[PDB]
Every structure is written in structure tokens, then in C-alpha cells.
A paper describes a structure:
Cytochromes P450 superfamily (CYP) is a large and diverse group of enzymes containing a heme cofactor which participate in a variety of physiological roles including hormone and secondary metabolite biosynthesis, as well as xenobiotic metabolism. Until recently, six proteins were identified in the Thaxtomin A biosynthesis pathway: TxtA and TxtB are non-ribosomal peptide synthases; TxtC and TxtE are CYPs; TxtD is a nitric oxide synthase that produces nitric oxide from L-arginine; TxtR is a cellobiose-responsive pathway specific activator. Although NO-related nitration is not an uncommon chemical process in organisms, particularly for tyrosine nitration, TxtE is the first reported enzyme that catalyzes a direct nitration reaction specifically in a biosynthetic pathway and thus it can potentially be developed for industrial applications.
In this paper, we report the crystal structure of TxtE in substrate-free form. Although gel filtration results show that TxtE is a monomer in the solution, two molecules are found in the asymmetric unit. TxtE presents a typical trigonal-prism like cytochrome P450 fold with a length of ~50 Å and a thickness of ~30 Å. The N-terminal His-tag, residues 1 of chain A, residues 1 - 4 of chain B, residues 175 - 183 and the last residue of both chains cannot be observed as there is no clear electron density for these residues. Two B′ helices together with B′2-C loop, F helix and G helix are located in the distal side of the heme, and are involved in substrate access and binding. In both molecules, the F-G loop (residues 175 - 183) is disordered. A clearly defined substrate access channel was observed between helix B′1 and helix G which can be classified as channel 2a according the common nomenclature. Interestingly, in the structure of TxtE a continuous hydrogen bond chain from the active site to the external solvent is observed due to the I helix distortion. Compared with these two structures, TxtE shows a unique proton transfer pathway which crosses the helix I distortion and is nearly parallel to the heme plane.
Author numbering: 2 to 174, 184 to 406
The structure:
Amino acid sequence: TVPSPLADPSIVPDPYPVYADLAQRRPVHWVERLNAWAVLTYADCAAGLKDPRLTADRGTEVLAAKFPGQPLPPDNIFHRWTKNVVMYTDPPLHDALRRSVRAGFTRAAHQHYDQVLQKVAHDLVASIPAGATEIDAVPALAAELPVRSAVHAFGVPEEDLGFLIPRVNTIMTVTQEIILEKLTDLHTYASELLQGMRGKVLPDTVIARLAAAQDGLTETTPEQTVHQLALVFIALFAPTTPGSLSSGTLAFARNPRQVERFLADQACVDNTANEVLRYNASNQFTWRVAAKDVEMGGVRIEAGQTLALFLGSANRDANMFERPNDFDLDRPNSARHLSFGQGVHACLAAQLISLQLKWFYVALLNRFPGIRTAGEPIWNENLEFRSLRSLPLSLR
Ligand code: HEB
């Protein structure tokens, strides 16, 4: 019953040496407070994400872990939701649900999002007053860009932001019932939005393409589109994107050489998203459940037991990324990071987010190449969704 040096918040601002300590001896071990087997190496994490033996059907288990002794009946909104979205379903249902939303994520769509995001990022960074000298990059940039991308790339109506953001914030973090009510709000909003009963959806956006494709859907139901749209809203306004932006900004702030590498060579620019994502996973760990007994890292994981796959540790496994603690844009294989997961449930917005990141650093660094930290960066108290709460920055 030895507690794990994970679980405890003290490691959040810099969890990587701890990950290393543990990975040396105990790459797979029990975490008392997560009710789960933590797995830490790249090999076993990738294996975990690809394995048809671990199920994504994990709502009951994760909810147990997060709200002990507070079970929910199968017809409760949380369970219907989990049963009807890509995140918590296995093939073949998962594949049908995934195919039902591909209209927003085609090659052509991303061709458009590229231009849109170039624009948005440039306007954001250009909006910084010419004599600024100091900034907290978290509220000013990292928290702001995903919102603007949500409006102009995804198609969330601007006027509806004030409805959606507090509700996702509540969901992501008081009471389980309040969270359930907010999730219900997200479903009802998705439903009414598609019927034109809410804000105006800008054209050529994700939600516009999704809406136009509803009449052509044959394997899935309107209800399932509502569920998945609720999921989309949650991921859209989660701290994951701002966390990536801010952690990357901090990485550049502490690595001038990579700033000049960035400004000189287009290769570095094109690898920037992947290297930032590798250096700090916004989602430090994701969850699985063993459908059957699995043998991993020298451990017999029993059927029904929960697994915590530490993508953040895998991104800095020296077995896969030589000198993993270095922020390096010339790195050959940054694209092998697990920050977007891997295989079946690989992040639906991976390319959109990569575009957002790239253009953000292009715009930031073509105006402020002389960025430094001006005081200690402050991290949130959570490891699972790890992100900077404050990043004080001197621009000039
Ligand atoms: C659209 C909206 C959206 C956005 C914005 C996002 C953004 C993001 N994302 Fe995401 N995702 C998503 C949507 C999303 N997403 C979905 C829907 C999913 C599921 C898929 C499947 O399942 O198939 C994911 C998934 C996912 C995963 C996997 C998990 C598992 O497997 O379990 C990960 C790791 C991630 C991450 C992420 C990050 C880090 C970010 C920032 C940077 N993602």
C-alpha cells in the first residue's frame, strides 16, 4: 500500500524527473489515489493506446475514481453521453460515430482552416499595443487564441461564447449534480444550435460542415450528433489548447537558440507544433479499462481494473526521443509524440490544433523574437489537465 509520488500535487510544476525515477524501477505500478495502474514508458503507452484489449468504455470507472460512492443510473445524461460519443466507445460503434463527423475534418476543410488560423493568429498578436514590454501570456494570448479559433475555425457563434465557456469551465474544474446539469445544458444547446435556434454559425467552419452533413447521415442518429457536439464543446473550451500554447511559449522563452532556429529554417517552423506538444502534454495522462487480463511492464493487470497511460512520461522517454528534456525543433521524430493519443482515438482536432499552434508561434515570433520570462511561471494544481495559470513575459 505504498503511495505513489504521482498523485501528490507538488510534482505538477515539474513532473518529469519524478516520471523518470519511477520509470527506472516501476514503469507500471499501482496509484492508490487514481484507483489505477500508472504506465510510464513510451513503448507500453503506445501499446496501451493501440490495444483492442483495453476498452475506451470507461465512464463508470473514471467517474467512480472522481466521484467516489456517487453512482449514476444507466439512463442518466452522463452515461447516454459516454455511450454515444467517439471518446468512450469501441469499434465498430466508435468508427461509425467518427465517420459521422468527418465532414468538418476533410483535407479541404483543413486547407481552409490554415488560412483562417494564419489570419486569426496574426490579428491576435498584432493587437498587442506597440509599447507593451510586459504581458501575462496566459490570459492575453494562450486563453484567447483557442476562443477565436473556436469562432472562426469551428463555428461556435461569438454571441454564444458567454453561454458555453462557464459551463465547460464548471465541468472541467463543484457538485456532481451541477456538472450533470451543465452537460445537459450543452446537449440542449447543441440541439437548438443545429435547428438555428441559437447563434449564427459562420460558414465554412467545422460546425457548418457538420450541420450541412446531417441530412446525409445514415448509420448514426440526430441524438448521437447532439452527444458528440457536446463532447466537441467540452474539448473546445478545455484547458488543453491554452496549456499547449502557454507551455510552448514558455519553452521558447527559455530557449533563445530555438527561437532563432525557428526564424531561420522553415523545417523548424513546420516541426514546432509537434515539438511543443511533445515537450509538454496538455493531457498528461488518459484512461483505459482492461476488458481482459493484460500483462504489462511485468505486471498482471486484472479485468475491470483501471489504467492511467502517462502520455507526458512517454513523450520524454529517452528510449524514443534522445535528450528528451531538450526543446529541439530540429528533432527528427517529434511527430511520434503521444499528446494527441494514438490509433483509433487519435485526437479529432490534431491537424487543426497543430495549425493553430504553428501560426501562433509564427505570428508571436515575427513580432517578439526577444521574449523572456519576467518572474516565475505558475502552474495549475492539476496534473491530468496540466496548464500554466500565469506566464509573465517581457516582449521586447
Ligand atoms: C474538436 C474539438 C477538439 C479540440 C479543440 C481538441 C484538442 C486537444 N486534444 Fe483532443 N479529441 C477530440 C476533440 C478535440 N480535441 C475528440 C472528439 C477525441 C476522441 C476521438 C476518438 O475517440 O475517436 C479527442 C481525443 C484526444 C486524445 C485521446 C485520448 C484517449 O485516447 O483516451 C488526446 C490525448 C487528445 C489531446 C488533445 C490536446 C492535447 C488538445 C489541445 C492541444 N485528444
